[PDB]
Design a binder for this molecule. Structure first.
Ligand SMILES: Nc1ncnc2c1ncn2[C@@H]1O[C@H](COP(=O)(O)OP(=O)(O)OP(=O)(O)O)[C@@H](O)[C@H]1O
Ligand SMILES: Nc1ncnc2c1ncn2[C@@H]1O[C@H](COP(=O)(O)OP(=O)(O)OP(=O)(O)O)[C@@H](O)[C@H]1O
Lengths: 353, 173, 292
């Protein structure tokens, strides 16, 4: 009964209107402070006696009064899109053990990613700079995003995911400066891992000058390029880039610095094919008689995704037979036939280096 | 009275458009169902004047004529809005006719190596056919089409499902 | 979040109101149900089962899949020249599954402004997850999924990024395993190699010209509403149809009634059919000469 009156008394405090946010430019004197609202107008105003001049400093987000236009309370920082970027969920752990190939590629990325964080001391002795970038591309084979995503959940620490659709921002391509925000909180929350998928759309070569937005993207590069040619230390933070083909990346991104290393995906070897087969036979129910080598010999050149699609199709063929336990004879039926159909749909699979 | 002696031509195209709206209860009774529309092309005599005949022979509600080249425009993505809006307008126009001239300009088929090129063209035609193959109504406003050459294959392969009654000139006997 | 209600200059949020946005971008298209059913097609009995499977099997048999460890299909690639007639069949089976159906056209992703298609797809699967289970259908994927070759640039490139963001949605995110989506192309000349996956395009059927047996039955299901003289061969037309399409057969059934007006016969006759066949196909005209 009385708790309601507590809420209603809170409304009495809600009779106090909010304030307008603004960034501190400079201070002309102790009675004159230059502040700029997010809207664009600038204002030379004063301040109250609760704040300290030393704590304010230029380039600080503060709240201005609705009328006096003076600072009351401040905040250190805020960012609205990033919270979404820190909510990515990758299962495994176990999924990291189920990917199989390519082993030695994993043994490269495990190091270039994990070692600089755990043992920074080994780098400073030799004099070698820790790689600040890496390039993983496909699909000659597959497994790019999976593997890297698994590292997010294995190394734990912090991870940040960015979809390539966030660069446009319709009119006013300010998302370029949102990259500077991104690297701001990358310098705060460090260490962190950053993923860049489908970079070919946002890292093209502006070969043929045309239309409009072709240029704005070239301006987003300039934020990436200048922040990774700094004037800045990205050593603690890590970045991963992926594409269909390294044709559009320009001499800028194919250059080291920004992209130090390059790991191409390869078609699964038959030895690795046996492995990836094994991890998909686990959850599935089969007859006590099983031979995986028949499938390995019959299935050559397929993608690790296409292998799983074939195993699932072998099972999705068993539901027509309605049987609970399914022999691998029925499997090799569905496998052989459907997989070969995938070869008929496999046109234009050849991709450049 | 401006016909140049063509009989079977002008008749067979009269019954596709004018008779269904002249005697609607007749075809609904004896239906079956009237056809969707026609296609005109061939030698220049007489391109595009046969439509003027439908103008003077229009019974009550005026119909709309459309010029082909205005579909394709600079700053790609304007044709998308373009082709879409006139359809809704037509549906409010209760059986009003829509006629595109020189479809061969926006009917460039099909694909080339590089670079597009036909991509901005293929959007126009393919969005046209896709919005033409919608199920609601669709569209009661019938259709009318004319061009010069029978090219290209993509529109020509898409029409016989959705269209019928392709006639050739004839031309003076 | 957003949409929170706040009054004029008061600058106080009284309540947080859902959900999302906006207009046509919120709801692309509201499809109640198609009028057609699977009984209006014939000759596809073998290949309609593969279509009906991928959509129906996840709905009812989830209890079976948890026991058998089966992962249901998601996207299905249906393609060919009309007809075929893939669109009508794929839609008709959606009334039988009761799932919510959202009509979507490919070129709609292309907009006058940038980033529209990306936001549009994100907004499309949003309410798909809200309306789950549901069915989303797209057509002319080949047009908006052409990656050309050399940069720069592709006008569709924002739609390639949007498509690759869709595939990325089925990649980095598991929940896209719900609310199946069907895609169909008129021609596989341009196809993205990246579309090969269980969540991406998996079930694939090449749809040739209908068999003679099929062309006979389909036109009979089309003319079953029409008054027909009880004398037809059915074999005749079936053998006499080469390069014909099932939709051309509908055009033939209408052509039969077009000259029935000048005939005056209130009931359709056998010879009217073959007449209409030779009418529209093949082409015209010239004259019968030199052949004696
Ligand atoms: N090594 C692997 N182990 C288990 N599953 C895999 C493996 N590689 C691929 N897959 C399957 O492929 C799917 C997508 O992974 P991945 O990111 O490689 O695809 P992709 O790189 O988007 O393919 P593409 O580059 O052709 O679009 C996953 O759902 C996964 O089930
Ligand atoms: N094999 C077939 N069986 C039954 N009906 C058919 C067949 N082929 C064509 N039809 C009929 O032809 C008509 C026209 O369909 P059409 O082939 O133009 O659609 P579609 O090709 O799916 O359209 P889109 O090219 O946009 O996918 C449909 O009403 C359909 O009933």
């Amino acid at each position: 009964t009385k708790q309601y009156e507590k809420s209603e008394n809170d409304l009495k405090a809600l009779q106090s209107v909010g304030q307008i946010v603004g960034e501190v430019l400079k201070q002309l004197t102790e009675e004159k402070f230059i502040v700029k609202a997010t809207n664009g107008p600038r204002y030379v105003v004063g301040c109250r006696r609760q704040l300290d001049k030393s704590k304010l400093k230029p380039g600080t987000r503060v709240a201005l009064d609705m009328t006096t236009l003076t600072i009351m309370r401040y905040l250190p920082r805020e960012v609205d899109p990033l919270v979404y970027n820190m909510s990515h969920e990758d299962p495994g752990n176990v999924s990291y053990s189920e990917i199989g190939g390519l082993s030695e590629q994993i043994r490269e990325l495990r190091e270039v990613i994990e070692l600089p964080l755990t043992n920074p001391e080994l780098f400073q002795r030799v004099g070698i700079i820790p790689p600040k970038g890496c390039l993983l591309y496909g699909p000659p084979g597959t497994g790019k995003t999976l593997l890297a995503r698994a590292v997010a959940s294995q190394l734990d620490c912090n991870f940040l995911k960015v979809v390539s659709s966030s660069i446009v921002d319709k009119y006013i391509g300010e998302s370029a400066r949102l990259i500077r925000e991104m690297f701001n909180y990358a310098r705060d929350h460090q260490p962190c891992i950053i993923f860049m998928d489908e970079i070919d759309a946002i890292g093209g070569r502006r070969f043929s000058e045309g239309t409009s937005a072709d240029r704005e993207i070239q301006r987003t590069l300039m934020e990436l390029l200048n922040q990774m040619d700094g004037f800045d230390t990205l050593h603690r933070v890590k970045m991963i880039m992926a594409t269909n083909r390294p044709d559009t990346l320009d001499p800028a991104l194919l250059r080291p610095g920004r992209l130090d290393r390059k790991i191409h995906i390869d078609l699964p070897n038959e030895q690795a094919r046996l492995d990836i087969l094994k991890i998909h036979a686990g959850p599935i129910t089969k007859h006590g008689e099983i031979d995986y080598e028949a499938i390995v010999k019959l299935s050559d050149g397929f993608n690790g995704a296409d292998l799983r699609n074939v195993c699932t199709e072998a099972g999705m063929f068993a539901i027509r037979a309605d049987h609970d336990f399914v022999v691998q004879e029925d499997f090799m039926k569905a496998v052989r036939k459907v997989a070969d159909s995938k070869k008929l749909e496999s046109k234009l699979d050849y991709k450049p280096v | 009275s401006d016909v140049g002696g063509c009989k079977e031509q002008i008749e067979k195209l009269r019954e596709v458009v004018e008779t269904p709206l002249l005697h609607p209860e007749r075809f609904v009774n004896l239906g079956i169902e009237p056809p969707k529309g026609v296609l005109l092309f061939g030698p220049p005599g007489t391109g595009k004047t046969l439509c003027a005949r439908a103008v003077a022979n229009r019974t009550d509600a005026c119909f709309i004529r459309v010029i082909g080249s205005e579909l394709v425009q600079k700053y790609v993505g304007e044709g998308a809005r373009m082709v879409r809006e006139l359809f809704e307008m037509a549906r409010t126009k209760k059986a009003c006719l829509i006629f595109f001239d020189e479809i061969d300009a926006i009917g460039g088929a099909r694909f080339d190596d590089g670079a597009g090129g036909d991509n901005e063209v293929q959007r126009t035609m393919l969005e046209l056919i896709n919005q033409l193959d919608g199920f609601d109504p669709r569209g009661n406003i019938k259709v009318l089409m004319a061009t010069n050459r029978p090219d290209t294959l993509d529109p020509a392969l898409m029409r016989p499902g959705r269209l019928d009654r392709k006639i050739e000139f004839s031309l003076p006997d | 979040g957003d949409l929170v209600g706040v009054n004029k200059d008061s600058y106080l949020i009284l309540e947080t109101l859902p959900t999302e946005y906006d207009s046509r971008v919120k709801a692309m298209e509201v499809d109640e149900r198609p009028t057609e059913q699977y009984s209006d097609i014939g000759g596809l009995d073998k290949q309609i089962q593969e279509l009906v499977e991928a959509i129906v099997l996840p709905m009812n048999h989830k209890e079976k899949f948890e026991n058998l460890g089966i992962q249901p299909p998601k996207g299905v690639l249906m393609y060919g020249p009309p007809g075929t007639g893939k669109t009508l069949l794929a839609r008709a089976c959606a009334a039988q599954t009761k799932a919510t159906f959202l009509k979507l056209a490919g070129p709609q992703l292309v907009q006058m402004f940038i980033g529209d298609g990306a936001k549009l797809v994100r907004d499309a699967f949003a309410l798909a997850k809200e309306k789950a289970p549901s069915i989303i259908f797209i057509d002319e994927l080949d047009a908006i999924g052409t990656k050309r070759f050399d940069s720069e640039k592709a006008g569709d490139r924002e739609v390639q990024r949007t498509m690759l963001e869709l595939l990325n949605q089925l990649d980095g995110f598991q929940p896209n395993t719900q609310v199946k989506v069907i895609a169909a192309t008129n021609r596989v000349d341009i196809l993205d190699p990246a579309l090969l996956r269980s969540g991406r395009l998996d079930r694939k059927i090449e749809f040739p010209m209908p068999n003679e047996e099929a062309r006979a039955r389909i036109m009979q299901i089309h003319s079953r509403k029409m008054n027909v003289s009880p004398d037809v061969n059915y074999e005749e037309l079936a053998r006499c149809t080469d390069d014909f399409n099932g939709a051309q057969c509908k055009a033939v059934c209408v052509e039969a009634g077009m000259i029935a007006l000048r005939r005056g016969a209130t009931e359709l006759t056998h010879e009217d059919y073959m007449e209409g066949i030779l009418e529209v196909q093949a082409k015209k005209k010239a004259n019968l000469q030199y052949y004696a």
